[model samples]
Target: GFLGAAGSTMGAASMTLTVQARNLLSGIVQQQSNLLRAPECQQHLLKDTHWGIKQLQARVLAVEHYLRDQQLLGIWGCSGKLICCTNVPWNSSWSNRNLSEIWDNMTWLQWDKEISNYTQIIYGLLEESQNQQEKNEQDLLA
Candidate 1:
């Protein structure tokens, strides 16, 4: 489930222009400028989008760790309180009005589920791309 969610997020990140996309573009521009100054070192200083994805993966892993710890600590406990402060607030219409705070508590679950779904899609794409690249290299070698 985690992998699927992570893969989806990774796919979304790859397809959509994330903050990393801007960073990658900036890196490309810088690399081009460097190339003009040093034609001999044109092969160096390439920052691929994959690198950014890896960074995001690390961040997601870190958050998962945090969430897991909070889960173990139990909601309404100290850890849950910490999580509430550490992460984004849950988006619930009931949280706006006054229905039941308990019903609105589902916000965390909803956010987590959505994030997991997105990440899973992204990882799937990354794995497929890696497989294709490996096959290409093998074919070339053959």
Candidate 2:
């Protein structure tokens, strides 16, 4: 029963895209992990927090574009980014106060809690997105 399937050649394309998504997800996850484990991140107020958020906003747009181009945006229209970046910069969840005031008033414990929750949300969304790619890869192989 040597049924040579011609469909498999097309499957190679799907596998390639899957690897691309996986690599993208892997890189960001590693960065987040490094941020969490840094020495000063433990007790300091993290003066550079706003910069990280800015980076997230920019970086996420690229991911959004990639997902749309690849037609894998079923996971979110603007899911992970909006919550992290906030649609309105001035109107944010940083206690509804400016970053300047926050640095002066917020404690490490409070900021840590906020960052921890944000990290959880980011991790969950990315994992789900990657799972979709993994799902496609398996489907193609099967």
Candidate 3:
């Protein structure tokens, strides 16, 4: 019945990995949600963090797809990092370019640091998943 009786679905190992991936995805989404509620974020309405959240969401989906296919080898390659560059266009008619530039630069730096931290956390989870797979293989061999 384990492998023959019924066409078959996911194995225990695969299910475990899927659960792990889902947990990581949940944690990341929660963190992003909390970050969005921060006072500074509420004050400036920066789009950078929104973009970063979207990127991370995409990464979680990609990882889930790869896990479903049992192709965990390349899962670690996706860097959920958001690239925020290029100056925001300023409307000289209504906005002061100098002050906007300073404020934007400050926000950009903070956003970059946050992106780096999130990327590291996601990467660590991926690494842990890979390590668990390897350990499962070794257990099987022994």
Candidate 4:
């Protein structure tokens, strides 16, 4: 089921990229800060996009935290939100229309490139943690 999730130590790189992705969105918003001063339509647009971005953050957060206590690294964040966001909006054609209200063709596609990158980071974290877990268990046995 949850095979592509990260371990505590494996979470570091995953989260590092996650945080950066969040920041990139933030900067994009700041560059167009006038959205806040505008009317309700613009505000709603901001909210939808914010929700999208939030999903992006929440997924990398999906690493089964208690396992982290027994393990190492600053492992936080879980997996479902990551998977949901990665596919739900990223693949959503309707949302592509929604997102189209903002971002030029180039900007939208460029950021999307990084969305894939976050997915890649999560996959790496999962595999890395899996390997380490096997090694750690071997220590227990030996």
Candidate 5:
């Protein structure tokens, strides 16, 4: 009954790319020390970078762990697998806003906008892949 199904494999690849991209994005966020490089801001920048890296790593690990679960449960058939169907519990929904949160009470609107753009790009890729996969399934059924 297997007509050489490949969508799940492709989805896995897509997920891996997404995870890598997230890591890079998080790195960029952590490296945003330009705002605090002055002597007066040195310690603050260092601390912010440290916390940013920690949050970024946590987000990266969360996605990586989710990918592992996706493998274990299989993509298209993950309707029942709790881990696969659900999100990575270790991550917060506001993972994208971690850095912005770090700057609470500060003027981080621009940074938040940048983060939103990245999020859109990532979600767009994932959404396109899902749409294509669904189209393939429909074609197969037809």
Candidate 6:
């Protein structure tokens, strides 16, 4: 019947949106992981970097599993609005709250202090390197 065909179409659309959401979340996870692996992050924040990286990895896995399981069960949309199946009902809020808690535990104030200290050291080193390079160039010219 026409109704059956329309229902099938809607289901396919929902699946498409679900796939897109998964892709987007995966990209975010990958980007965060890459940043955590950067030399600057590793060298400067060695003590705290691993903790944040693990937390983010766990969060990404939890969200991905929840989304996949819910999609398999045909539960789509967030907060009762079946817009595009991009939002997970309770998982989105839960993940956000957990991430906030992690951030709080990590101490944002301390992070800011560390960032300031590290940036100053890095800039100082960079200035010194540049000065040395310039001195070498001047010597060569002379």
Top candidate (TM-score): 2
**Candidate 2's residue-wise lDDT over 46-120, tens digit each?**
567776678768779878876764453334334433122222223244346555554545554455565665555
Cα-based TM-score, every candidate: 0.22, 0.32, 0.22, 0.21, 0.23, 0.26
Give candidate 6 misplaced runs (Cα > 4 Å): 1-15, 18-21, 49-64, 67-142
Model 1 agreement with the true structure over 18-86: per-residue lDDT tens digits: 344245346555755866898545333235556557755765675586566455444323342322222
Question: Which ten residues in a row are the worst by lDDT in model 6?
Answer: 85-94
**Segments of candidate 1 deviating more than 4 angstroms:** 1-47, 75-142
Report how far off residue 38 is in candidate 6 (Å): 1.9
Cα RMSD of predicted structure 1 = 18.6
What TM-score does prediction 4 earn? 0.21
lDDT of 5 at 98: 52
Worst 10 residues of 1 by lDDT: 80-89
Per-residue lDDT value at 96 in model 5:
47
- Cα-based lDDT at residue 133, candidate 3: 69
Identify the runs in model 5 with alpha carbons over 4 angstroms from their true place. 1-47, 75-80, 83-142
Task: Give the whole-model CA lDDT for all candidates, comma-separated.
Answer: 0.47, 0.53, 0.49, 0.46, 0.49, 0.51
Model 3 agreement with the true structure over 1-142: per-residue lDDT tens digits: 2122112222222233334545655766676688777968644445577866776678788667746534433454333322222222333443344644433334433434435545555445666766676688889995
lDDT of 6 by residue, 1-142 (tens): 3122222333333334545545646767787688777978755555787776886688778788866655533422233333532321332421344544434444434444535545545444444555666688789995
Between prediction 1 and prediction 3, the one with superior lDDT is 3
Clashes of each: 20, 0, 0, 8, 0, 0
Index of the highest-lDDT prediction: 2
RMSD of each: 18.6, 22.4, 23.8, 17.1, 18.8, 26.6
